[PDB]
Ligand binder design. Structure first.
Ligand code: LSA
Ligand code: LSA
Ligand code: ZN
Length: 257
């Protein structure tokens, strides 16, 4: 089964998932000097006021906070997107050290972690159908650097002890994901893929330029999670990131000058 270890990590994934070597794989390095300002891009619309979080789960490769997506409650619109995308879950990728952990890079710079807010296109009815479409998902990517604490993250970090190992979940209601956003919604966008198997090429990526700051204590608690299940040898959940993939025939567009 796939993971981030030495003989099941990203360099192995193509054997079970040939699309790993495909034409629009993610993440990528964002070369800021080559990204072109696109004046026809619209401002992002992030409408999270009615979000209903449900559960938090350790799935053995990250932890995810899940939302009620049976209605238009928390949606992403505008920007590069046509139509309405419902928030399904968010999760993170992070490192064993502050100098690595993000999946996207900016002029080859790696951040300590990366937040992915995953949304699916409501015209396809459910997320399973959406992942089979080239415009099925929109993922909002946000970089984390280590410095001052992010108050809106603390509720997440404080429940992680209760989902230490693979397969554990806990109630996680009334969490407001607006507390995870930076001030600016300036972004880069490009067509790409899931960054975990099955690596489906169904994602419009929207990566925010402004990172959020989190404290060393907050990210250290990420690194106390386990890849393994309860009663198995402990393997810390760290470095659960896929490295940058070939850009190939794609252009990254910027929403800002
Ligand atoms: O992602 C992973 N699954 S695993 O528990 O086999 C493991 C061990 C070491 C490093 C990473 C990983
Ligand atoms: O681990 C993931 N990174 S991602 O935002 O591309 C994504 C989308 C859907 C399911 C999982 C994942
Ligand atoms: Zn992700």
């Amino acid at each position: 089964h796939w993971g981030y270890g030495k003989h099941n990590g990203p360099e192995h994934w193509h054997k079970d998932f040939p699309i790993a070597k495909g034409e629009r794989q993610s993440p990528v390095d964002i070369d800021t000097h080559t990204a072109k300002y696109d004046p026809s891009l619209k401002p992002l619309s992030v409408s999270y006021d009615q979000a209903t979080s449900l559960r938090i789960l350790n799935n053995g490769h990250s932890f995810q906070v899940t939302f009620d997506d049976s209605q238009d409650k928390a949606v992403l619109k505008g920007g590069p997107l046509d139509g309405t995308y419902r928030l399904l879950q968010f999760h993170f990728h992070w490192g064993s050290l502050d100098g690595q952990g993000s999946e996207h890079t900016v002029d080859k710079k790696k951040y300590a972690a990366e937040l992915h807010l995953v949304h699916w296109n409501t015209k396809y009815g459910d997320v399973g159908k959406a992942v089979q479409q080239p415009d099925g998902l929109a993922v909002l990517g946000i970089f984390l650097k280590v410095g001052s604490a992010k108050p809106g993250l603390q509720k997440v970090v404080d429940v992680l002890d209760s989902i230490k190992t693979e397969g554990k979940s806990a109630d996680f209601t009334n969490f407001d994901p607006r507390g995870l956003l930076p001030e600016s919604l300036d972004y880069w966008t490009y067509p790409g893929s899931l960054t975990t198997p099955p690596l489906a090429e169904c994602v419009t990526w929207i990566v925010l330029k402004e990172p959020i700051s989190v404290s060393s204590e907050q990210v250290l608690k990420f690194r106390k999670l386990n890849f393994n299940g309860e009663g198995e040898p402990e393997e810390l959940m760290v470095d659960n990131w896929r490295p940058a993939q070939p850009l190939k025939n794609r252009q990254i567009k910027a929403s800002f000058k």
